[PDB]
Design a protein around this motif. Structure first.
Motif, PDB file in Angstrom:
ATOM      1  N   UNK A 326     -18.854   7.433  -6.211  1.00  0.00           N
ATOM      2  CA  UNK A 326     -17.720   7.005  -6.114  1.00  0.00           C
ATOM      3  C   UNK A 326     -17.014   6.454  -6.993  1.00  0.00           C
ATOM      4  N   UNK A 512      -9.337  -1.293   7.556  1.00  0.00           N
ATOM      5  CA  UNK A 512      -8.960   0.248   7.529  1.00  0.00           C
ATOM      6  C   UNK A 512      -8.230   0.620   9.044  1.00  0.00           C
ATOM      7  N   UNK A 515      -1.624  -0.660   9.419  1.00  0.00           N
ATOM      8  CA  UNK A 515      -0.596  -0.139   8.779  1.00  0.00           C
ATOM      9  C   UNK A 515       0.710  -0.582   9.028  1.00  0.00           C
ATOM     10  N   UNK A 516       1.457  -0.756   7.946  1.00  0.00           N
ATOM     11  CA  UNK A 516       3.090  -1.108   8.340  1.00  0.00           C
ATOM     12  C   UNK A 516       3.585  -0.582   6.900  1.00  0.00           C
ATOM     13  N   UNK A 517       5.005   0.054   7.105  1.00  0.00           N
ATOM     14  CA  UNK A 517       5.841   0.269   5.996  1.00  0.00           C
ATOM     15  C   UNK A 517       6.240  -0.979   5.280  1.00  0.00           C
ATOM     16  N   UNK A 524      -3.000  -1.606   5.226  1.00  0.00           N
ATOM     17  CA  UNK A 524      -3.524  -0.723   3.983  1.00  0.00           C
ATOM     18  C   UNK A 524      -2.388  -0.469   2.876  1.00  0.00           C
ATOM     19  N   UNK A 525      -1.233  -0.649   3.331  1.00  0.00           N
ATOM     20  CA  UNK A 525      -0.060  -0.487   2.568  1.00  0.00           C
ATOM     21  C   UNK A 525       0.199  -1.789   1.737  1.00  0.00           C
ATOM     22  N   UNK A 578     -12.584   5.425   1.821  1.00  0.00           N
ATOM     23  CA  UNK A 578     -11.564   5.107   1.144  1.00  0.00           C
ATOM     24  C   UNK A 578     -10.436   4.753   1.848  1.00  0.00           C
ATOM     25  N   UNK A 580      -6.322   3.402   1.745  1.00  0.00           N
ATOM     26  CA  UNK A 580      -5.232   3.838   0.741  1.00  0.00           C
ATOM     27  C   UNK A 580      -5.294   3.481  -0.473  1.00  0.00           C
ATOM     28  N   UNK A 583      -7.308   5.327  -3.014  1.00  0.00           N
ATOM     29  CA  UNK A 583      -6.563   6.623  -3.486  1.00  0.00           C
ATOM     30  C   UNK A 583      -5.545   5.835  -4.695  1.00  0.00           C
TER      31      UNK A 583
ATOM     32  N   UNK B 328      13.017   6.472   4.916  1.00  0.00           N
ATOM     33  CA  UNK B 328      11.867   5.761   4.081  1.00  0.00           C
ATOM     34  C   UNK B 328      11.135   7.067   3.381  1.00  0.00           C
ATOM     35  N   UNK B 578      -2.363   8.913   5.327  1.00  0.00           N
ATOM     36  CA  UNK B 578      -2.212   9.098   4.119  1.00  0.00           C
ATOM     37  C   UNK B 578      -1.373  10.142   3.706  1.00  0.00           C
TER      38      UNK B 578
END
Ligand SMILES: [Cl-]
Ligand SMILES: [Cl-]
Ligand SMILES: [Cl-]
Ligand SMILES: [Cl-]
Lengths: 598, 597
Positions: A326, A512, A515-517, A524-525, A578, A580, A583, B328, B578
């Motif tokens: 990895x 994991x 999420x949120x924009x 993860x963001x 993995x 975000x 990556x 967005x 993703x």
């Protein structure tokens, strides 16, 4: 002290004693009742090697306080008695008492480095019992440190309570995994003349690569040494030689990060035979550069843990290989053995795979103020670890001195290095490491984030400043603009010193699947934005020569309100999937060369 | 004629949405005329909403047949001086509407509005409004329900006898039914009122000419005025009758992601109505899709109207969230798969500058997934008559939207089989006849081995392909997916006309991961898309990419549906996988215009 890794050779048996062992929790009477003199009664079974804490479903076992007893039968051929018979414990965490039949053979303090004992042949009967008592207790005298009266800063309650049972009080984040962590093996050598240690260094001046050797022996015999390529071609050899000498390696191929080359160095002494893999390379710090083979290196990687399910800290050879795979997939070149020496199997694999290692002692938790000062005199309550700290440095360097992959020693993690007395505690340890390492590699300590960072004694001691910083997590949480400004203001001070410095920890807990924009802690963001913000600063600083994240993977910790089933700062999950940000780093590290970035 | 109901100086608007009484039909609701009295032993149901997911009952979710909604309707008698109208924005699938036990109207088609006047004489001091809602689908409904055909997506390894009779959807998405969109009472003047407004535009230099036709009932004088957003009059004509034109000097054009809406104000007698209106042109020329004479590249999705727990029901906060996520991500467009969406969404897309492919309810027109398009006598599909009505009603509702740039006549019909051209040619002719703007028409093409026999080639202005190279074929062999993709798409590219993806994707469960290509993981979703774009980016007639799907959505149950369809870039609660971040990066670097010039 000398601890060559046990291998099967023309003169040396290697018998692994790993497997299913008997296992019994001490109840306060195990030594009084001399449990080691008979078969353990009403015992459980436990795999060896492994930490014992997670194998069953018992909180009492996981959170046990004190001793446990392991035991197995040891029925071996009497003809082994023509040889010297040695029992090697690669690691027993934290302290061990080893009995053969009713006889105490050795005791050891220090949960992460090997120890061994000859078995006197008179002790070996037709049938034998091997019993290993394992102590898990930690305090102001152990490395890692256990708290005594200091309060729980990561696991504090809103309202005080009386615990049901006495328990260890770790002064460190990671879970206190204990037991027979690494393999137990029996090996033999010739009785009358054998090799006790091998020391190799490299000289690269005048366009000539040479290996310098020092062979330590017991008994009287003749010495020979030969150096062989991967394909088995002898490129240098001498017979009936001295204990010290040098061999020129024509056409030498250097060991490089991510381009390993290991020669085989074969030694004979009398009837004894031992083969050591060896990579030829130089390490030096010059100005603000970290030079490997005279080229300016940039660390890309992680602080790791030895942590997998269900063995805990136990040696996991498939996952070691997965982890290196990895790292190469991600574009990393390095990691730090946070916060204890790792298994020899890992270190030898890193030599074979070209992964650069910062090799760290067990000295985490040397901090009583996270009124008695940490480095007050012992007689007034100061920390009691310096004597054992010296032993750990000696033992670590003795074990790992020949590894090409080891480029730096980390003397301690997040000690109280901004307080009075820290320099006095640490100066003898930095001196000791420099004296004992035959290659004189750089030394550092890993620096806790602190308001008075200009008073960190690392500035007076270290060849590279190694910083743990959490701009955007433990401060400026959900305010990455403020994090960037705070990061730049402090890291510009470090850059102004003109020496190499790096991150050894930086990260953000990330579950994991969350999420949120819009910037939100634990998603993860946010982990990606956290790292983007930090790199906006570090990429502008010419003396910043390395980035190691906290952490490679999620790992187990003690319980409390800020640990979401362990530490969640991994780029990968505990089962190595993995996030975000993993990556993100694959993309970033793919564009950053190992050499010549700064 | 179905103008969106608005509050004006001549028109009341009274929303009847809220908590209604609700009762499953037990087989006796019409016989016992439940609509004549208060529903007895009834549940309560939010309106608007699909009813299937509000409770915790499988018998309710999987109900077959009718249900009855009801509320009290106590209104002022002084409204009787006005014309009183009940507007149903959508009742899925079929409706019978009763006021006080008099059947006032019936409607077939679950996704388009209908309305009825309330005769003054029927309005008592206290009234009951009852709506019976039918959920049944078959060979005569759009969307199509199976009758004797086999379940392809939800087939068992071993046949079984179902406990109860159930619908057999010939489509993926869950058969959400109920009072899907708002029910409202509105009024107009009795004697003279506006029934419809039609607007087309022509751009002569920087001057826009707006041609209007104002359809009215009664005898009065018609006037029209066009106003900027800030309220300046830019054109006005009085006593114009039905048809006319007018010009706007230095007109501000509506553009994707740069919307501009004028306000068109109309008066007829005492009636007043204001229509928002964007000025823009649409034309296909060669292999180009021209919006305002510039070569557009579609970036976006097939969507669904799907949220929890309302199902298909109008969800205005989520509509606004979804458009925000589109901006967005760098998208510019979506398709209303597979039914007309709410007027509230369509008007919001006009306001926000999101381009729309407006699609009929005609999904499932396929009996061989007896020929599909055999004569009805021989067992062929029985949908063409209703299909014509849906096209009429969809274009009547949406004709004035700047955001609508193309009509989709059907999704995944049996267009490679005999009779398909004969079925579809009258429908394409109808759409071109009825759309005043003569916008492009397409059908959305099912993946098929004989793709050169797709009758889309003979009918459509743009070829719209649903293709799953790397999912339904070549799964976990993306090198083979790339080769198979290129071989087919080079054929379409050789025809010289614009074509695009309207569907492509891979089921992806958030939280599943692997570095090494593995179906259902987040990484595989990205690799699937990378592989397809390797091909499409090299093809100059490929003018758009719309993924399947914007978000995970509910479906029928079966072995290949992991709690619904998981091909969303976002989860059902709108969280990015993703691949959502992949497309944000990709679409950030692709212009809306001039990507392939
Ligand atoms: Cl830790
Ligand atoms: Cl941490
Ligand atoms: Cl669908
Ligand atoms: Cl699908």
């Amino acid at each position: 002290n000398a601890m060559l890794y046990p291998i099967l050779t023309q003169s040396r048996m290697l018998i692994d004693l790993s497997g299913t062992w008997r296992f019994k929790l001490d109840d306060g009477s195990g030594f009084e009742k001399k449990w080691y003199e008979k078969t353990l009664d009403d015992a459980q079974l436990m795999p060896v090697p492994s930490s014992y804490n997670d194998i069953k479903e018992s909180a009492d076992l996981r959170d046990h306080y004190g001793w446990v007893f392991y035991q197995r039968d040891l029925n071996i051929p009497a003809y082994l008695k023509t040889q010297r018979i040695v029992l090697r414990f690669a690691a027993v965490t934290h302290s061990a008492k080893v009995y053969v039949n009713g006889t105490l053979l050795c005791e050891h303090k220090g949960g992460f480095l090997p120890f061994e004992t000859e078995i006197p042949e008179n002790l070996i009967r037709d049938e034998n019992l091997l019993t290993v008592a394992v102590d898990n207790r930690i305090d102001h005298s152990t490395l890692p440190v256990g708290r005594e009266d200091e309060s729980n800063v990561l696991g504090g309650s809103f309202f005080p309570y009386t615990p049901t049972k006495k328990q260890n009080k770790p002064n460190f984040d990671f879970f206190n995994y204990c037991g027979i962590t690494r393999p137990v093996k029996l090996y033999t050598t010739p009785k009358d003349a054998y090799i006790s240690d091998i020391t190799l260094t490299s000289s690269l001046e005048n366009n000539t690569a040479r290996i310098n050797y020092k062979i330590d022996t017991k008994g009287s015999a003749h010495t020979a040494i030969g150096v062989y390529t991967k394909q088995g071609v002898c490129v240098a050899q001498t017979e009936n030689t001295g204990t010290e000498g040098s061999l020129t390696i024509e056409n030498a191929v250097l060991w490089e990060p991510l381009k390993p080359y290991l020669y085989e160095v074969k030694i004979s002494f009398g009837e004894d035979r031992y083969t050591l893999p060896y990579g030829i390379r130089s390490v030096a710090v010059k100005g603000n550069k970290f030079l490997i083979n005279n080229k300016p290196f940039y660390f890309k990687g992680y602080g790791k843990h030895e942590d997998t399910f269900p063995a805990g800290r136990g040696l996991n050879m498939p996952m070691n290989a997965k982890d290196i795979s990895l790292m190469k997939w991600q574009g990393a070149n390095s990691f730090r053995t946070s916060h204890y020496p790792y298994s020899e199997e890992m270190m030898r694999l890193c030599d074979e795979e070209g992964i650069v290692v910062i090799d760290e002692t067990t000295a985490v938790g040397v901090h009583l103020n996270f009124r008695v000062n940490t480095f007050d005199p012992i007689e007034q309550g100061g920390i009691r670890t310096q004597s054992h700290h010296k032993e750990v440095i000696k033992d670590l360097i003795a074990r790992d001195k020949n590894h090409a992959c080891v480029v730096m020693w980390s003397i301690a993690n997040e000690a109280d290095t901004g307080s009075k007395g820290a320099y006095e505690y640490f100066k003898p340890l930095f001196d000791l490491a420099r004296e004992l390492d035959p290659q004189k590699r750089p030394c550092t300590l890993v620096s806790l984030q602190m308001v008075n960072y200009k008073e960190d004694c690392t500035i007076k001691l270290s060849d590279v400043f190694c910083l743990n910083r959490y701009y955007g997590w433990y401060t400026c949480g959900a305010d990455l603009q403020a994090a960037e400004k705070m990061c730049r203001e402090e890291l510009e001070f470090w850059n102004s010193l003109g020496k190499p410095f790096m991150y050894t920890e930086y990260g953000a807990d990330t579950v994991m699947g969350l999420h949120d924009t819009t910037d939100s802690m634990f998603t993860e963001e946010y982990q990606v934005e956290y790292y983007k913000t930090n790199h906006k600063v570090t990429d502008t600083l010419d003396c910043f020569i390395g980035e190691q994240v906290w952490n490679f993977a999620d790992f187990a910790t003690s319980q409390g309100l800020i640990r979401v089933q362990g530490n969640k700062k991994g780029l990968f999950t505990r089962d190595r999937k993995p996030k975000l940000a993993a990556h993100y780093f694959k993309e970033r590290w793919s564009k950053i060369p190992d050499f010549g970035y700064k």
